[PDB]
Amino acid sequence: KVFGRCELAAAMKRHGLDNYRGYSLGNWVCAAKFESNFNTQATNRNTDGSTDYGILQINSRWWCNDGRTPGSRNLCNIPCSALLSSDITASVNCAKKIVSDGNGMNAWVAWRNRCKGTDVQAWIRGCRL
Secondary structure, X not given: OEOOHHHHHHHHHHOOOOOXXXXXXXXXXXXXXXXXXXXXXXXXXXXXXXXXXXXXXXXXXXXXXXXXXXXXXXXXXXXXHHHHOOOOHHHHHHHHHXXXXXXXXXXXXHHHHHOOOOOHHHHHOOOOO
16 A cells, blocks of 8 residues: 555554654654655565565565564564555564664654655645644
8 A cells, every 4th residue: 555645644643653752753754754755565675674564664574474584573573575565554563673773763764864854844734634
């Protein structure tokens, strides 16, 4: 599924991400844009041989199991393929674990380089308040 911008924002707000660990909804939508372009099926291999999965490009090194990442912890206790569903529930519950882990949303390098410090509430502009 390719989510629309306000569509994704309403799904993330309904699953509890607006203001989670102090991060406003605009932050999470901005990260989803530059991680996956709102595409739940997006996958991208990392140079260390792990792969990132889904809307928020959750990485198989630490968070989900894909069977091909020597060392994987699978801390969200989830197959990485289940992060590619049209229903973002698994991805949101796992992202809640990642942002809570110590370095906040800086865990998403795309958030740190392209979203952090920017007017992120522009990402929920026009969406039903």
